[PDB]
């Protein structure tokens, strides 16, 4: 089983390793033994479906600061912290007209997501590890 001998379009044999031609079948079998042939041979989903949604009534406490939202949530009894994310109003269940603003929504696993619309372009940062905190001793979420 030589992977170098191939058949051309003229009824001949072609050695692609040494790039040689052979007319008859007796010259292709005798071309494997030699110096040039030896030289050429030597050179070469589950977390989203199991999440219960009862949708409780959330209560946020917004306050205009100057140099911040305080979301009161019940005890979740888990290590999963509620995460906040800023999205656009272009994607919705009914898609209302004149929706050209952004909404920052905070979501938890046993609770429902609370969203607040921001008419301004950029006045704060919606990052999780930058300006957010979640005290599990009092179960209080803050974001500024």
């Amino acid at each position: 089983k030589d992977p170098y001998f191939m058949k051309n379009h003229l009824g001949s044999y072609e050695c692609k390793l040494c790039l040689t031609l052979h007319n008859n079948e007796g010259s292709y079998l005798a071309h494997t033994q030699g110096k040039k042939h030896q030289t050429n041979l030597a050179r070469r989903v589950e977390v989203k479906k199991f999440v219960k949604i009862g949708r409780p009534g959330y209560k946020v406490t917004k306050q205009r600061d100057s140099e911040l939202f305080q979301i009161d949530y019940p005890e979740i009894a888990e290590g999963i912290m509620p995460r906040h994310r800023f999205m656009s109003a272009y994607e919705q269940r009914i898609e209302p007209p004149d929706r050209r603003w952004q909404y920052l929504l905070m979501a938890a696993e046993p609770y429902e997501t609370i969203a607040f619309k921001v008419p301004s372009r950029e006045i704060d940062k919606a990052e999780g590890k930058f300006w957010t905190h979640w005290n599990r001793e009092t179960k209080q979420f803050f974001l500024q």
């Binding site: 989903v45 989203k48 999440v51 949708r55 959330y58 997501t113 619309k117």
Partner: peptide, 17 residues
Amino acid sequence: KERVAYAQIDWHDFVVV
């Protein structure tokens, strides 16, 4: 685990109160 939980939450259930 927090990155797996944040990438699997529903971001379409928006409620303004």
